[PDB]
RNA sequence: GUUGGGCACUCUAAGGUGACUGCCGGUGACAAACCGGAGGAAGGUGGGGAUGACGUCAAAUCAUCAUGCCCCUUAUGACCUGGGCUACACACGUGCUACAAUGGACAGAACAAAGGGCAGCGAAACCGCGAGGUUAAGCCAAUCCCACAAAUCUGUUCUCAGUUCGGAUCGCAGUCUGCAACUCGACUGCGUGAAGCUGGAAUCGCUAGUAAUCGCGGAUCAGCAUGCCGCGGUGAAUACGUUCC
């Protein structure tokens, strides 16, 4: 069950509280960041591949 | 305070010199002899007061 | 005429700052300079590992820094000069 | 109007030494009105006691940031800097006493997997 | 557990962003539009050997620059390539697209085209020594102070898969002013999936 | 590796001593010098009141009673567990005296550590006291094991 | 449910008021556990769906301030 | 003594009244504000007027056995009706909804 | 600091300069280097981060993804409601709160940093003991809001008890979020107040703005934080040494 669940999130449910955040590139909840609307590992991959214009390696 | 500190310190350094002499009797020749002589005389000097 | 540029790179924002600064300064508008305004930055800490290893993380950094430019005297020659400044997509002019 | 900046532990004080008798005025309040625990009051006075400056300048201080001992360090550092601006002479005395160092001991940044930038949670075998 | 990718490591030191704009209020929507763009363009021109795509966002306008290392497959007949490229993007994205196509002189220094050229040869069943050594000769004659190509997977040996390093010259991954091109590619063969990792120390910036 | 050294702050607004601020930094619970300074000055004011002396001299006299000449370290050779007597260098004499004052004061039990530390100083002055149990017992351990040095 | 009103589902309220407009009947198969017990429910043996079956419970004078799923534990233990 | 149970003579009034089953701190302060004892007296030192007011104020309030009998009625209520929360009351498992693979050591 | 005024000062964010054993003396082959000294905001990789070599454990991930091979297919696929992932006799890792006068409660005075806010942050006023409620200013934010920091300091009060310690658990009545808080949410109010009076064998963290302690913030998210990630506040004790693990 992957594309069915992605499709179910891409629907409009019965109630607004059934709406939950999801991947948009690599299908999974648990740690989809609201800002990027992206999964965590896919954020790490794309931010390594020079995309996602804000994030570089952090040090302070 | 003073006499007890002097007594215990002089006796511990005295046993240091004596054990250092008696562990090896013929080596690192003779500084231990002056050490034990001065320490024993100073122990008598401290106990005399 | 309170132009707030905000970008991710400081050098691109410097180019788009001094371009407005010079084009408005040359025609007498009494340009108060590129006032540097505090950056809003966000830190995203991420479990590096695919599956396990909560102790193994990696931190990413997004800095958006902004600078304020004010033009006080009207001088609409400067406004017609500002309207034709084509400066790139990095900086987000908002007058 | 001799002026000195003091920085300590994310606190910054602005010390202006006016010719007076020895009153220190922190944000329109006085010393024990704003700093209790008079070890900080005598320690905040150390640049004015090491070189003989005992009653020849009042001190006016504008402080912000940090906590009260951090503000104490910023005030005494700004005093030592403005008191160099008074006489450049006794820089050897202040420097042998410290007083131009700005202890850079900022509170350290927390690391991931640690509790408090050195703390490991607990190890069990 | 090993090395951080140097592409993601030198962003904001010397290597720029591919995707260059500033966020206004729909940053996520611009991101996922550009993911659909990059997927579509990498599918259509992963035959025509395009390495990298830089996207601008210019207030209803998008400047896409395309780095190919050959012009006349991508500018082509003049009309037809930029037409057939901009037309489906103007529809499936929803706004205006401008296309500027920069050509990479010295095609053997960009690690994406190098890793794809090694992957194709693995799909053409060229031996995994001939691919890497041939390509290392191509890069070291095209002029590079170091190249490292590492291929892993089932090499034609069934129940054990292992990694293979070949390299020439200095590839100093710890010097943070290095200008190293890193790139992955995949090669789906009958025995599974091979992974090509190429990174090219090309020269540093003072 | 090599030895590293430390520092400490010179005055106290009443009782201008180094070692009294050394006791202020001691007995600090959870980063509160304010509570330890209040406890300390109320205790030394009790020592100035209850015995008509300045509490500096009573406090140093108590220190002189507690500061141990001879620690006895360990030296395990084989299955022997020998203890070896060590002449304490006087920095550690002062710091073991301060630990024993602080620990046995708060270990006594009275209706403030003001009173507990004050009465522990008053006992270590007139040498019979709680930290001086540790002084006597360390000197007895060094006296029995003096054969090794 | 504080001052918005109490809560019941419209289908179970509909069925119970159909049951109360004439007379009582068999158990009411109701998947709703989330719904409070109104005092107009009293006497109605109703079948709460616990997760795998419909358990019949008979409602009294006391069983009002709670809900339906307090009267159907879902986990069997020893 | 007042509700059939003692209060200690040597405490203050606000907290000697706490030992009655049904009066904590804040109901004690609600009493002694109406009475006006100013919260600083022993209860070994009061007058019969000023303590009789304390007695009949506590007599108006639901304190000693009323509380026990009604809470026994509540426990018997959710024991008799069924009521999984009363199953938790009965069995020795936590009532308000609490995890039980760990501690839950007030109840067994 | 509201106005006018000023860029001095802090601050902010850009370009610099800046610390390199550079200079002195000593030791040491003359080297490399080391010890003390001077200057200096900074002294010997100044403090920290990011960076994790060849390889080891066929370590982990087919459940982020992609996947070779094998299997199911009107089902090992799909929808829907309901339950469960929160069970509970037990063990076991990590954590929170205490066992109390350096304490508890009450009142007064002050001091932060870092970060967030558009169908969002939400002032102020009013009501409610309180959780909160109604109307709503300003704010796409160095302005406005979150946001009244807390330990601290100073007074009042208790006086060493299973208590004016501690809050488990529990009854009743409430509040908010949201179709909906029964299993299974957080918070408040009243009442009840337990075990616990510093912990056996064993065992862990930390070398300085650290440990200890105190609050603050943000992700996630309608709502759920004692977890995590950062932030400041006060702020130590010790390092003789390499005998032992």
Swiss-Prot record, chain C:
- InterPro entries recorded: Ribosomal_uS10, Ribosomal_uS10_CS, Ribosomal_uS10_dom, Ribosomal_uS10_dom_sf
- In the UniProt record, does the keyword Transmembrane helix occur? no
**Stored SUPFAM superfamilies:** Ribosomal protein S10
Q: Which GO terms describe its cellular component?
A: small ribosomal subunit
Assigned keywords, A-Z: Ribonucleoprotein, Ribosomal protein
User: Pfam families recorded for this chain?
Assistant: Ribosomal_S10
A GO BP term here is: translation
State any single GO MF term: structural constituent of ribosome
Q: Could you name the domain of life of the organism this protein comes from?
A: Bacteria
Subunit note:
Part of the 30S ribosomal subunit.
Instruction: Identify the HAMAP family for this entry.
Output: Ribosomal_uS10
Family to which this protein belongs: Belongs to the universal ribosomal protein uS10 family.
Purpose: Involved in the binding of tRNA to the ribosomes.
Q: NCBIfam families given for it?
A: PRK00596.1, rpsJ_bact
Q: What is this protein called?
A: Small ribosomal subunit protein uS10
- Organism of derivation: Bacillus subtilis (strain 168)
Swiss-Prot record, chain D:
What GO MF annotations does this protein's record show?
A: RNA binding; structural constituent of ribosome
GO biological process terms on file: translation
Q: Which InterPro entries match?
A: Ribosomal_Su5_D2-typ_SF, Ribosomal_uS9, Ribosomal_uS9_bac/plastid, Ribosomal_uS9_CS, Ribsml_uS5_D2-typ_fold_subgr
Instruction: From the UniProt annotation, give the residues forming the signal peptide.
Output: none
Q: Name one GO cellular component term.
A: cytosolic small ribosomal subunit
Q: Which Gene3D superfamilies match?
A: 3.30.230.10
Please give the subunit comment from the record. Answer: Part of the 30S ribosomal subunit.
Q: Which family does it belong to?
A: Belongs to the universal ribosomal protein uS9 family.
What is this protein's name? Small ribosomal subunit protein uS9
UniProtKB/Swiss-Prot annotation, chain E:
Q: Cite a GO CC annotation.
A: cytosolic small ribosomal subunit
SMART domains with a match to the protein in the record: KH
Query: Which keywords accompany this UniProt record?
Result: Ribonucleoprotein, Ribosomal protein, RNA-binding, rRNA-binding
A Pfam family the protein falls into: KH_2
Signal sequence segment: none
For this protein, the record's InterPro entries field holds: KH_dom (IPR004087), KH_dom-like_a/b (IPR015946), KH_dom_type_2 (IPR004044), KH_sf_prok-type (IPR009019), Ribosomal_S3_C_sf (IPR036419), Ribosomal_uS3_bac-typ (IPR005704), Ribosomal_uS3_C (IPR001351), Ribosomal_uS3_CS (IPR018280)
Query: What GO molecular function terms would the record report?
Result: mRNA binding; rRNA binding; structural constituent of ribosome
**Domain KH type-2 positions:** 37-105
Family that this chain belongs to: Belongs to the universal ribosomal protein uS3 family.
What is known about its subunit structure? Part of the 30S ribosomal subunit. Forms a tight complex with proteins S10 and S14.
User: What the protein does?
Assistant: Binds the lower part of the 30S subunit head. Binds mRNA in the 70S ribosome, positioning it for translation.
Q: Specify the protein name.
A: Small ribosomal subunit protein uS3
From Swiss-Prot, chain H:
Q: Which Gene3D superfamilies match?
A: 1.10.8.50, 30s ribosomal protein s13, domain 2
Any one of the GO CC terms: cytosol
Is DNA-binding among this UniProt entry's keywords?
Answer: no
Entry-linked Pfam families: Ribosomal_S13
InterPro entries noted in UniProt: Rbsml_uS13_C (IPR027437), Ribosomal_uS13 (IPR001892), Ribosomal_uS13-like_H2TH (IPR010979), Ribosomal_uS13_bac-type (IPR019980), Ribosomal_uS13_CS (IPR018269)
Q: Name one GO molecular function term.
A: tRNA binding
For this protein, the record's PROSITE patterns field holds: RIBOSOMAL_S13_1, RIBOSOMAL_S13_2
Q: Could you tell me what this protein does?
A: Located at the top of the head of the 30S subunit, it contacts several helices of the 16S rRNA. In the 70S ribosome it contacts the 23S rRNA (bridge B1a) and protein L5 of the 50S subunit (bridge B1b), connecting the 2 subunits; these bridges are implicated in subunit movement. Contacts the tRNAs in the A and P-sites.
Family that this chain belongs to: Belongs to the universal ribosomal protein uS13 family.
Q: What is this protein called?
A: Small ribosomal subunit protein uS13
Which source organism? Bacillus subtilis (strain 168)
